[PDB]
Amino acid sequence: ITGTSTVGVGRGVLGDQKNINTTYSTYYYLQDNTRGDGIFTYDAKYRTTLPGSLWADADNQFFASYDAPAVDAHYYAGVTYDYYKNVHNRLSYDGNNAAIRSSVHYSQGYNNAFWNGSEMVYGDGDGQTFIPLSGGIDVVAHELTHAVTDYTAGLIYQNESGAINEAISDIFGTLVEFYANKNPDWEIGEDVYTPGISGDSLRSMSDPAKYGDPDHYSKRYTGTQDNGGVHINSGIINKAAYLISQGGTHYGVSVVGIGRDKLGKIFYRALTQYLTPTSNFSQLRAAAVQSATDLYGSTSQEVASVKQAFDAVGVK
């Protein structure tokens, strides 16, 4: 829409109050003109037709419970755009400020959220397994990172390359959660998963086996479900990335942590300059080692820690 940029106020899924960038033109729309070519939030009104209608509101105040998922989809897309811009100097997901669009209230009782190749889509959850998925900043950033991957390495969504694609989304989803300093941790989806149980999450990067995912290459899933285990075998890479950052001893192999910041620079470089659509775990290890080498020198502690971490999860 063409109109005047302004700032509205609302409440997210978890009840927190936040300011959001809106546009006025008769109605106030969830359209943020301050980031790239814009961030646009749509109402899919419980249908599966996309994108739905750009979200329009009469008084620029978004405190209705129907508003909550839109508030957080719109706000957390902005935080994720800021992370990529300020930390990695990348303007939006294509690197040229593409507009970011999201639809919320997709379908009924839909327990998932996803990047479809053109925009983000968020279910409201069934209220038992999940609450509206845009309330999780790691989920939002995980999904928006698939758009970055799609425009850069182009990892296909199956077998080892799909598992890398998923882990790269958990890694940067976590880094965004730390960047916003929103009670950060190494778990995925803990703010929106099972409202009735405290302390769990969908997946864990620090201990993937707590939820039954593999934490070592010898435990990888070899069957056909989940497109060859893309959500399961991502645990092996997630554990490696947690060790590079935080350090630890895993299956008797000791890793000196180098921190989150360097973790993000190594993996962003590996993703945008050395990964290809069919890269496997062994090629990811080579890419991460070469990236660390480029940035810190072949005899740095950073290169040594990337090697130990892949050794610890059995990836040669």
Q: Using CB under 5 A, list all residues that contact Ca ion.
A: 57, 59, 61, 138, 177, 183, 185, 187, 193-194, 197, 200
Residue 250 to residue 244: CA distance in whole angstroms:
12
Q: Using H for helix, E for strand and C for coil, what is the string for the chain? A: CCCEEEEEEEECCCCCEEEEEEEEECEEECEECCCCCCEEEEECCCCCCCCCEECEECCCEECCCCCHHHHHHHHHHHHHHHHHHHHHCCCCCCCCCCCEEEEECCCCCCCCEEECCCCEEECCCCCCCECCHHHCHHHHHHHHHHHHHHHCCCCCCCHHHHHHHHHHHHHHHHHHHHHCCCCCCCEECCCCECCCCCCCCCEECCCHHHHCCCCCHHHCCCCCHHHHHCCCCHHHHHHHHHHHHHCEEECCEEECCCCHHHHHHHHHHHHHHHCCCCCCHHHHHHHHHHHHHHHHCCCCHHHHHHHHHHHHCCCC
Q: Of residues 74, 88, 231, 250, which has the active-site annotation?
A: 231
Report the nearest approach of Zn ion to the CB of residue 146 (Å). Answer: 6
Query: Given the rule CB under 5 A, which of 117-125, 165-173, 236-244, 288-296 is the region that contacts Zn ion?
Result: 165-173
Q: Which does 32 bind (CB under 5 to 8 A by kind): Zn ion, Ca ion, none?
A: none
Q: Of residues 143, 160, 250, 302, which has the active-site annotation?
A: 143
Nearer to Zn ion by Cβ, of 33 and 149: the residue is 149
Active site residue 216: no
279 binds Zn ion (CB under 5 A): no
Tokens of 275: 């990964």
Q: Which does 138 bind (CB under 5 to 8 A by kind): Zn ion, Ca ion, none?
A: Ca ion
Is 249 part of any known ligand binding site? Answer: no
State which residue has the least CB distance to Zn ion.
169
Nearer to Ca ion by Cβ, of 93 and 130: the residue is 130
161 binds Zn ion (CB under 5 A): no
Is 61 part of any known ligand binding site? Answer: yes
Is 177 part of any known ligand binding site? Answer: yes
Report the nearest approach of Ca ion to the CB of residue 104 (Å). Answer: 15
169 binds Zn ion (CB under 5 A): yes
Report the nearest approach of Zn ion to the CB of residue 230 (Å). Answer: 8
Active site residue 119: no
User: Which residues make up the interface to Zn ion (CB under 5 A)?
Assistant: 166, 169
- Catalytically active residues, by annotation: 143, 231
Binding site residues for Zn(2+), as ranges? 142, 146, 166
Binding annotation for Ca(2+): 57, 59, 61, 138, 177, 183, 185, 187, 190, 193-194, 197, 200
